[PDB]
Amino acid sequence: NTSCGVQLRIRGKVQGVGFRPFVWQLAQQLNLHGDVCNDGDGVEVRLREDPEVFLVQLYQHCPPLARIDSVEREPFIWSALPTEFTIR
Amino acid sequence: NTSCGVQLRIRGKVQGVGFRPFVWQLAQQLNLHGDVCNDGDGVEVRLREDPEVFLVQLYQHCPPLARIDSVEREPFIWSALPTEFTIR
Amino acid sequence: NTSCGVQLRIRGKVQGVGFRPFVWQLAQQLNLHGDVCNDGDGVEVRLREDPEVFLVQLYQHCPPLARIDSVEREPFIWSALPTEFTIR
Amino acid sequence: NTSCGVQLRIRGKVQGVGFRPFVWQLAQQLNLHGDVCNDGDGVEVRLREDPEVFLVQLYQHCPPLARIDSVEREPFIWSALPTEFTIR
Amino acid sequence: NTSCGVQLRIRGKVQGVGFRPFVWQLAQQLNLHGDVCNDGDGVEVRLREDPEVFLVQLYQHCPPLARIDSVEREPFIWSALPTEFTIR
Amino acid sequence: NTSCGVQLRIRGKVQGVGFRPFVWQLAQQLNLHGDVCNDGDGVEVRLREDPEVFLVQLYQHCPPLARIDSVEREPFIWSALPTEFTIR
Numbered sequence: 001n002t003s004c005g006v007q008l009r010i011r012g013k014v015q016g017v018g019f020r021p022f023v024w025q026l027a028q029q030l031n032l033h034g035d036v037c038n039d040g041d042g043v044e045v046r047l048r049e050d051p052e053v054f055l056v057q058l059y060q061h062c063p064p065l066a067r068i069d070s071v072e073r074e075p076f077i078w079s080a081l082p083t084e085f086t087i088r
Numbered sequence: 089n090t091s092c093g094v095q096l097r098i099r100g101k102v103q104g105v106g107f108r109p110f111v112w113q114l115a116q117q118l119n120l121h122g123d124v125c126n127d128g129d130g131v132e133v134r135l136r137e138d139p140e141v142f143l144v145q146l147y148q149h150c151p152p153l154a155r156i157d158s159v160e161r162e163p164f165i166w167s168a169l170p171t172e173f174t175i176r
Numbered sequence: 177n178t179s180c181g182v183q184l185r186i187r188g189k190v191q192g193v194g195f196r197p198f199v200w201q202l203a204q205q206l207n208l209h210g211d212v213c214n215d216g217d218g219v220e221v222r223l224r225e226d227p228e229v230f231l232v233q234l235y236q237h238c239p240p241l242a243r244i245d246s247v248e249r250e251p252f253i254w255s256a257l258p259t260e261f262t263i264r
Numbered sequence: 265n266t267s268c269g270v271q272l273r274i275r276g277k278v279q280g281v282g283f284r285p286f287v288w289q290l291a292q293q294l295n296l297h298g299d300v301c302n303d304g305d306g307v308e309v310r311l312r313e314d315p316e317v318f319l320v321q322l323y324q325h326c327p328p329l330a331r332i333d334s335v336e337r338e339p340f341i342w343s344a345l346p347t348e349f350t351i352r
Numbered sequence: 353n354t355s356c357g358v359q360l361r362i363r364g365k366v367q368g369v370g371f372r373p374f375v376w377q378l379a380q381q382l383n384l385h386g387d388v389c390n391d392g393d394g395v396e397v398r399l400r401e402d403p404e405v406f407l408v409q410l411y412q413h414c415p416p417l418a419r420i421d422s423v424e425r426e427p428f429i430w431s432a433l434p435t436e437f438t439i440r
Numbered sequence: 441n442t443s444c445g446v447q448l449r450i451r452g453k454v455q456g457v458g459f460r461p462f463v464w465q466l467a468q469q470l471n472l473h474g475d476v477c478n479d480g481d482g483v484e485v486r487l488r489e490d491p492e493v494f495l496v497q498l499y500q501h502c503p504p505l506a507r508i509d510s511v512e513r514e515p516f517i518w519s520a521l522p523t524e525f526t527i528r
């Protein structure tokens with residue numbers, strides 16, 4: 001059933017730069033679950049887990065072509081909990 | 089803005105027994121924020137904070153006329169965070 | 177990959193009483209993941225999530241034939257995270 | 265240096281009943297650190313860790329001569345963190 | 353009543369640079385409560401919530417004239433919980 | 441007895457640069473417990489506490505000769521909890 005999640009909205013130069021694969025790889029390394037997509041207003045990451053380590057490493061290890069201008073976070077409710085981390 | 093909350097649904101003999109005032113007093117003692125109401129399917133408690141101590145003490149210190157048959161919990165999103173604990 | 181879990185060891189009159197199904201139902205209601213088994217020294221519950229609400233409700237809603245004499249907890253590492261709650 | 269702690273104030277029939285040793289044993293089982301004392305207004309327990317499992321088990325496994333009428337909690341700051349659980 | 357807070361002490365080139373407004377805006381975006389002031393030994397931020405995302409973004413999005421040389425954290429007790437984030 | 445810990449594996453130019461003393465000093469400032477060592481595949485930090493603030497500050501305040509290329513984290517179980525932070 002339902003659970004508390006977090007949505008991150010990452011804006012900047014975040015498309016055509018390997019950003020979704022970067023996020024996926026970070027999520028795999030950190031054993032995170034949820035998804036990533038680019039919906040036209042940056043990159044949206046939805047996580048089951050707390051985002052803090054992910055956010056630290058998002059910034060520090062940003063791909064060389066990418067540039068992160070802002071990140072916003074908000075809570076939301078998962079309808080079903082994710083069992084993988086996927087690119088959508 | 090928004091924040092992760094918890095809603096508790098408490099069922100049993102939970103009306104006409106001092107239940108809403110009991111919840112209010114417990115919330116005051118525990119410095120909790122949110123609200124309590126009786127909507128016809130038991131008593132609904134919405135909290136800003138984690139509910140664990142509240143739940144322990146709800147059961148242990150249940151008013152003598154009351155009887156708690158079940159408690160369910162689920163997350164939800166507060167649209168604005170509460171600054172008091174109120175009976176609604 | 178790996179994650180921090182909790183193992184609970186529940187002892188008492190906890191077999192022949194509907195205890196494993198009780199635990200399963202509680203875990204379903206609380207959206208918990210992991211497993212339950214009876215290994216001859218009581219009932220072992222392994223969870224992905226924090227156990228506090230589960231423990232409160234384990235005691236308060238213990239099946240009428242059952243009796244809980246003790247519960248112990250310890251951390252452990254999940255090799256793979258559970259995606260369901262199962263009786264083993 | 266300093267850290268966030270919790271103080272619990274447990275009132276009732278909580279002296280002459282094995283209460284301080286009960287608390288000590290519970291703290292040992294739960295791998296908690298801090299102290300317990302009886303200062304004339306019940307029993308005060310100060311912990312380094314979150315108190316929720318402790319509180320559940322305090323109530324459920326209360327010694328047979330004892331009776332717990334109320335428990336209050338408040339935060340405080342440890343000046344030095346405790347490395348044992350002691351009766352004071 | 354009282355609650356566990358965190359105080360951050362941010363030192364460097366952190367005055368005359370838009371630092372207090374920067375902190376305020378970050379706190380608004382992150383839905384944080386507490387206050388910020390410059391007391392002559394850098395900038396002090398007191399929060400009700402965990403500071404981790406705030407700290408990540410403090411560093412990454414530091415105003416261009418500012419420079420953060422160090423940040424220290426310590427717990428403290430709020431006498432009353434804050435309902436806004438304010439510049440003091 | 442046992443408790444949930446975190447192990448961090450920090451790789452890059454992290455030897456001959458004051459890295460272990462840097463970690464020790466950070467851990468002292470943050471009131472952390474555990475240890476640091478260089479085992480030939482970077483620097484391993486084991487903590488009792490959550491690592492998030494530590495990780496933020498590890499990156500931001502990296503010694504000038506050092507360079508951090510990657511950090512990985514995983515949970516593990518402490519056999520005994522640490523009471524100091526030590527260089528091993």
Ligand SMILES: O=P([O-])(O)O
Pocket residue numbers: 014015016017018019020021038
């Ligand atoms: O288009 P991407 O590869 O930057 O996600």
Ligand SMILES: O=P([O-])(O)O
Pocket residue numbers: 102103104105106107108109126
């Ligand atoms: O009707 P109440 O007093 O039990 O809430």
Ligand SMILES: O=P([O-])(O)O
Pocket residue numbers: 190191192193194195196197214
């Ligand atoms: O044998 P059980 O039904 O008490 O688990």
Ligand SMILES: O=P([O-])(O)O
Pocket residue numbers: 278279280281282283284285302
């Ligand atoms: O006096 P005590 O043994 O109940 O603590």
Ligand SMILES: O=P([O-])(O)O
Pocket residue numbers: 366367368369370371372373390
């Ligand atoms: O003086 P401030 O604008 O840097 O706070």
Ligand SMILES: O=P([O-])(O)O
Pocket residue numbers: 454455456457458459460461478
């Ligand atoms: O060899 P270290 O000083 O960089 O730890």
